[PDB]
Amino acid sequence: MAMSNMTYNNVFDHAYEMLKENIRYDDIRDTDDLHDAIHMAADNAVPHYYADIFSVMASEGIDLEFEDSGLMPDTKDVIRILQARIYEQLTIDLWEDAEDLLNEYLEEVEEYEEDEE
Amino acid sequence: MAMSNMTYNNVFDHAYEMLKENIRYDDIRDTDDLHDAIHMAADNAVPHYYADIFSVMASEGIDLEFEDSGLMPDTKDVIRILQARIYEQLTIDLWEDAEDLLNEYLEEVEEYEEDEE
Amino acid sequence: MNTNNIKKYAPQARNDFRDAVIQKLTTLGIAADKKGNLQIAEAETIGETVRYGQFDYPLSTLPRRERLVKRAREQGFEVLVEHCAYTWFNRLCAIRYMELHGYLDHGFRMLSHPETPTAFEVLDHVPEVAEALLPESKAQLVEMKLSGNQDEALYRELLLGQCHALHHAMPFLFEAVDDEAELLLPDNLTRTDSILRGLVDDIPEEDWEQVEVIGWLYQFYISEKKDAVIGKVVKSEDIPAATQLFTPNWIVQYLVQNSVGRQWLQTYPDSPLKDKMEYYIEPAEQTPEVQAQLAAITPASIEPESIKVLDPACGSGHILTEAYNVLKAIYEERGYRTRDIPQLILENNIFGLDIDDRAAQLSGFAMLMLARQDDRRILGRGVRLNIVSLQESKLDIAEVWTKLNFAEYKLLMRTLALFTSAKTLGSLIQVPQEDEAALKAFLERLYRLAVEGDIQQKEAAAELIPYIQQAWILAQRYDAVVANPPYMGGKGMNGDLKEFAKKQFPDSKSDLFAMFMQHAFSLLKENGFNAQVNMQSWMFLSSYEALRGWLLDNKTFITMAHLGARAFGQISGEVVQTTAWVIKNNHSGFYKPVFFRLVDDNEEHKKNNLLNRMNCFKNTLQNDFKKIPGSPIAYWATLAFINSFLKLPALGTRAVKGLDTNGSIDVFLRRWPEVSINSFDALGKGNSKWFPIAKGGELRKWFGNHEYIINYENDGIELRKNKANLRNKDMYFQEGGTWTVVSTTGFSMRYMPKGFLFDQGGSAVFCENNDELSIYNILACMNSKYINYSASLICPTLNFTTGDVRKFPVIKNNHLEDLAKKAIEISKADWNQFETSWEFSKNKLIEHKGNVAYSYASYCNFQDKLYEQLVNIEKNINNIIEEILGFKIETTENSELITLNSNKIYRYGQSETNDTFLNRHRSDTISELISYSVGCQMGRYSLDREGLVYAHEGNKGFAELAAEGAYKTFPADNDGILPLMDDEWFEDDVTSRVKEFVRTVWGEEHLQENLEFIAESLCLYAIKPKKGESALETIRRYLSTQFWKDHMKMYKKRPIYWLFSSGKEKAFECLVYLHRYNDATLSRMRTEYVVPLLARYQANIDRLNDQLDEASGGEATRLKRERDSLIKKFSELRSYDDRLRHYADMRISIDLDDGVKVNYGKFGDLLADVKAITGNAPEAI
Ligand SMILES: [Mg+2]
Known part of the structure; x- marks a missing residue:
């Protein structure tokens, strides 16, 4: 009920898998198109259960201070701020290592192009 | 450590004991002078370990929405906001029951006049 | 549900009753305004038709209505409205109970029609009910039966006829003659839309099967008014209203069996009722003298008609029913006719009184119902009843005794005068016995005038009977009293009541309750029994010491049961501790009291214990309680302790109370760190401006609690203007002992050196000029287990004062002196190892050498050695003397606790006990080290000499100290401002100087290992570990994040190093020493710290613009982000520069004497956490 054990690593793995799914489905070919592909990948990664959110912030791998002042919601609820922090951390981590999947997909599609036939 | 089980009830009990000790030490004999006593009691009651704060916020007895917009800190850290929320909740809960202690102390100290001897 | 239904139905029912009464009064012509002035309508009648609002009352009702106005002349409108509402409610409840019981003459329900809701069963049985109640109007009623209508007061007429029929044997509620309420009958009350249908539907059938519903109506129905009046103190209006409660039956039976049943058994041993009792307690052993005296005074046998029982607070009447049952059992044992027994019992065996008419009426109704269910010749003959009491006395004369057909006149006048102001004084009014018997004869004369004579004689007899009856009842000199006094709180203290108490004892x-107990003793004959219950807070107070002495001098104990707390199922009752006791009027010096301790037991467990009769301590005398001062009668204490208590002398006048101040402590008491040391008396003699004071704090033994300072300039002339108390201005500046008046947890005494002052909170003890006893011996004794237990026992309230300490015993020895000296030395050594004491010398980790881990291990070993030594000394001092007599086990873990900061249990909470204390503690130590480092940079501490170096005011004389050579190994800053950034641009960066400090202290061979150890130690508890970073980055992050909080917590919201911050983005942060702040500080900060930073930001902003443009790609997200970072910082720093210039244009001068609390709010929005320190929001210009 009020007890849960979810770590940041599970969230990161889920986000990584969803990013791979998005880049495969949408047929991303350029780096600038990755932004949105990352954004959606983060959207379906932040938990909505309050217990899970509180357990994630106590895990290892996520800091407790914002880096950009433009990503803080102007609200009175504390769930939104924590969700925004998780979203920013996931965005940074995913964008840190993202060209690998893009170039792998590009080389694979080049291999199986079969002379455009 | 991380596996910390600290609830809002323990914090409330500690704050109540501190308030009783402060009102006994200071010897306040008026209803409208309890603001300083309750402020002092509430200040030295919130924890500082981040794991304790995250375990308290997920406990039973404290909500997740601010009631006053003027108590929101202006900072980029998330521990400060949670501490302010806990402080406000404790202040409201303790100010709910504050006249009983004052009148009990007054009626108890009334019985030690010794006819000015 | 069943009990909650009455509670939830009482308020709306009472409101409806009051609204109906006031509406009918207004329609009649009686109106009341907010002020309460009468608004009687004009009695102008055109003739044979009264011009009211919408009603045409008969002219014959006009005079009776005037009586209501007459009532308005003698009693308030609210009082009569409440009385009428209660009368109607009681009558409807009585008739409903009677019709539900099915004991009517015709056996037909009146208000409720079976199998037909919202109707009357008598509607179909009109002729039978008519001939059963009013035959003369039967045929006319039959005519109404022919109409099939007229649901008007004709039904109320039948109800009044039923009441008149019941008046033959029940005259105290139903009257055959026309009543005042007959004129005020509510309009359409018989209609199905009235409150009668709501009463029928709301009240179920099952709840009528209970027998305690009378008490439910007595208590729950008035609970709303009690809650309404609990807010304000009542003086004379709600005296009986707020003193209504239900009493459990089992304690009533226990008291009754030990009051009259015990007396009945002791009267003659041949009573076969030995097996008929279950709560009776048989005494085990007594001295032969008291046994012979009891045998001599006890008559061989007495008649069963001589039993006298008084109940000053009958309340619901359960005690009356229990007494009636016991008397019936006794008479059946003796052998008597089963029908005359209730008559004789009500004649000369049961009596009672009360203050509320409602309680008396309910008790009478319950008694009559029980008699009807028991006797069969009752309800056909009638019998007088004694329930009401303390009725108001009318002043009408020359008419009451005119019809009397006349010594007794003077007595009648006196008793008429006495009963005038009877409501306020309660049941405490007494009448001399000599005027009783003749008065009783007067009552018989009234009985001879009750039916003999015309109507005027009967009216006079009815007016004169109640006062004579009340006087006779209160002057019966009963032999057994069983009642529970009511509870009086803050509202019970009245000025007139206090005057009466002063007139009384x-x-x-x-x-x-004490006055009730005293009166019950007074109203009890010789060799009587008084069984009562009360609260526990009557045996452990200084006020009741004289009362306890009087009780033990004039009476004796028989059986006391300590009910204690956990009563009534633990519902409400913040103070539920209670006791019961039975007292015999005969004085027994050497009696053997019997005590049962049922404390902290639930009701079921308490009943089980009472039935099993365990935990009995019949091992004490009656004069033994006189040995301990104050007579604190206790049963767990052994006789050896009592005997040994008086074998040792106690402290004399060596205890002296502290001085007192009348207020404005904010301008007198300040903490020591926030003042100059030149004006300090303990350091730097020459000026006597500030002096140490003692106030007492948490638990601490033999030393500590030195953290407050008072102003005592010129022997005191500034505070002498107020002249609060200036108590004992002769024993100051002398060594001795101190202890805390406040409760806290236990009792402890600490050493007090010279040059100190003591306040009211901390009281002081001084040795005499040439006394044999020594101070160290006193300190050794006062911390012993024996004295702790004695102090706990004497005053469980934990309010140790001067009067309660001048009787503690003290022993004499020789080793106790050296033991106390060693304990004091160890405690002082433990106390003087932190920065918060003015005897701090050096840190405990830099005095060793080698490795940081080696130093930490040495520190831990030192602390463990101190702890073990103190534990061994405590064990030795406990075993050395221990009175060399009997002793008890450890009372509490608090009484066997060692108070040291080294003891981790005492430091990190006594409740939690985990292995995490092995980590957190470590981190804390490292934090302290870092603080000391800053103390070296700011100039407060130095690595060459010991103690404080510079703590003066105004940054004057620092140049001389710097030139002399105080700071040579570790140079100190000259400006006094330490920047705090995330870059090494400045040469005053705190992290660089911390690294330099570490390298200087521990060499330059394993600097990296030391830095790694420090960084790892900080991340354990203080902050959160990160992914990957060097030690220096962790140190910088800790300094920028979790250093201000720790410093502000250490000094308790009185910071020494003030923080200047820019705002949301940490563009500029600085630390300023409070004692090195002159009037030219802000200008330097603006000049040589802010402008170069702005120039650097501007020069770095444009450079990154071209970097992003060149080689733009996947790194463009990583890049240009800093470009967004520097945009906000520039504008924020510009705004801060504008504010700083505005404030620096004004030359602000500060004074340390004012204090941090006031001086911290003179800089506007330039500091940090202004509201958290000053208490009010900052003001922006
Ligand atoms: Mg400097």
């Missing part, structure tokens, strides 16, 4: 005038 003042020994126990503090509370009303």
Whole structure:
């Protein structure tokens, strides 16, 4: 009920898998198109259960201070701020290592192009 | 450590004991002078370990929405906001029951006049 | 549900009753305004038709209505409205109970029609009910039966006829003659839309099967008014209203069996009722003298008609029913006719009184119902009843005794005058016995005038009977009293009541229950039994010491049961501790009291214990309680302790109370760190401006609690203007002992050196000029287990004062002196190892050498050695003497606790006990080290000499100290401002100087290992570990994040190093020493710290613009982000520069004497956490 054990690593793995799914489905070919592909990948990664959110912030791998002042919601609820922090951390981590999947997909599609036939 | 089980009830009990000790030490004999006593009691009651704060916020007895917009800190850290929320909740809960202690102390100290001897 | 239904139905029912009464009064012509002035309508009648609002009352009702106005002349409108509402409610409840019981003459329900809701069963049985109640109007009613209508007061007429029929044997509620309420009958009350249908539907059938519903109506129905009046103190209006409660039956039976049943058994041993009792307690052993005296005074046998029982607070009447049952059992044992027994019992065997008419009426109704269910010749003959009491006395004369057909006149006048102001004084009014018997004869004369004579004689007899009856009842000199006094709180203290108590006995005038107990003793004959219950807070107070002495001098104990807390199922009752006791009027010096301790037991467990009769301590005398001062009668204490208590002398006048101040402590008491040391008396003699003071704090033994300072300039002339108390201005500046008046947890005494002052909170003890006893011996004794237990036992309230300490015993020895000296030395050594004491010398980790881990291990070993030594000394001092007599086990873990900061249990909470203390503690130590480092940079501490170096005011004389050579190994800053950034641009960066400090202290061979150890130690508890970073980055992050909080917590919201911050983005942060702040500080900060930073930001902003443009790609997200970072910082720093210039244009001068609390709010929005320190929001210009 009020007890849960979810770590940041599970969230990161889920986000990584969803990013791979998005880049495969949408047929991303350029780096600038990755932004949105990352954004959606983060959207379906932040938990909505309050217990899970509180357990994630106590895990290892996520800091407790914002880096950009433009990503803080102007609200009175504390769930939104924590969700925004998780979203920013996931965005940074995913964008840190993202060209690998893009170039792998590009080389694979080049291999199986079969002379455009 | 991380596996910390600290609830809002323990914090409330500690704050109540501190308030009783402060009102006994200071010897306040008026209803409208309890603001300083309750402020002092509430200040030295919130924890500082981040794991304790995250375990308290997920406990039973404290909500997740601010009631006053003027108590929101202006900072980029998330521990400060949670501490302010806990402080406000404790202040409201303790100010709910504050006249009983004052009148009990007054009626108890009334019985030690010794006819000015 | 069943009990909650009455509670939830009482308020709306009472409101409806009051609204109906006031509406009918207004329609009649009686109106009341907010002020309460009468608004009687004009009695102008055109003739044979009264011009009211919408009603045409008969002219014959006009005079009776005037009586209501007459009532308005003698009693308030609210009082009569409440009385009428209660009368109607009681009558409807009585008739409903009677019709539900099915004991009517015709056996037909009146208000409720079976199998037909919202109707009357008598509607179909009109002729039978008519001939059963009013035959003369039967045929006319039959005519109404022919109409099939007229649901008007004709039904109320039948109800009045039923009441008149019941008046033959029940005259105290139903009257055959026309009543005042007959004129005020509510309009359409018989209609199905009235409150009668709501009463029928709301009240179920099952709840009528209970027998305690009378008490439910007595208590729950008035609970709303009690809650309404609990807010404000009542003086004379709600005296009986707020003193209504239900009493459990089992304690009533226990008291009754030990009051009259015990007396009945002791009267003659041949009573076969030995097996008929279950709560009776048989005494085990007594001295032969008291046994012979009891045998001599006890008559061989007495008639069963001589039993006298008084109940000053009958309340619901359960005690009356229990007494009636016991008397019936006794008479059946003796052998008597089963029908005359209730008559004789009500004649000369059961009596009672009360203050509320409602309680008396309910008790009478319950008694009559029980008699009807028991006797069969009742309800056909009639019998007088004694329930009401303390009725108001009318002043009408020359008419009451005119019809009397006349010594007794003077007595009648006196008793008429006495009963005038009877409501306020309660049941405490007494009448001399000599005027009783003749008065009783007067009552018989009234019985001879009740039916003999015309109507005027009967009216006079009815007016004169009640006062004579009340006087006779209160002057019966009963032999057994069983009642529970009511509870009086803050509202019970009245000015007139206090005056009456002063006129009465003042020994126990503090509370009303003690006065009730005293009066019950007074109204009890010789060799009587008084069984009562009360609260526990009557045996452990200084006020009741004289009362206890009087009780043990004039009476004796028989059986006391300590009910204690956990009563009534633990519902409400913040103070539920209670006791019961039975007292014999005969004085027994060497009696053997019997005590049962049922404390902290639930009701079921308490009943089980009472039935099993365990935990009995019949091992004490009656005069033994006189040995301990104050007579604190206790049963767990052994006789050896009592005997040994008086074998040792106690402290004399060596205890002296502290001085007192009348207020404005904010301008007198300040903490020591926030003042100059030149004006300090303990350091730097020459000026006597500030002096140490003692106030007492948490638990601490033999040393500590030195953290407050008072102003005592010129022997005191500034505070002498107020002249609060200036108590004992002769024993100052002398060594001795101190202890805390406040409760806290236990009792402890600490050493007090010279040059100190003591306040009211901390009281002081000084040795005499040439006394044999020594101070160290006193300190050794006062911390012993024996004295702790004695102090806990004497005053469980934990309010140790001067009067309660001048009787503690003290022993004499020789080793106790050296043991106390060693304990004091160890405690002082433990206390003087932190920065918060003015005897701090050096840190405990830099005095060793080698490795940081080696130093930490040495520190831990030192602390463990101190702890073990103190534990061994405590064990030795406990075993050395221990009175060399009997002793008890450890009372509490608090009484066997060692108070040291080294003891981790005492430091990190005594409740939690985990292995995490092995980590957190470590981190804390490292934090302290870092703080000391800053103390070296700011100039407060130095690595060459010991103690404080510079703590003066105004940054004057620092140049001389710097030139002399105080700071040579570790140079100190000259400006006094330490920047705090995330870059090494400045040469005053705190992290660089911390690294330099570490390298200087521990060499330059394993600097990296030391830095790694420090960084790892900080991340354990203080902050959160990160992914990957060097030690220096962790140190910088800790300094920028979790250093201000720790410093502000250490000094308790009185910071020494003030923080200047820019705002949301940490563009500029600085630390300023409070004692090195002159009037030219802000200008330097603006000049040589802010402008170069702005120039650097501007020069770095444009450079990154071209970097992003060149080689733009996947790194463009990583890049240009800093470009967004520097945009906000520039504008924020510009705004801060504008504010700083505005404030620096004004030359602000500060004074340390004012204090941080006031001086911290003179800089506007330039500091940090202004509201958290000053208490009010900052003001922006
Ligand atoms: Mg400097």
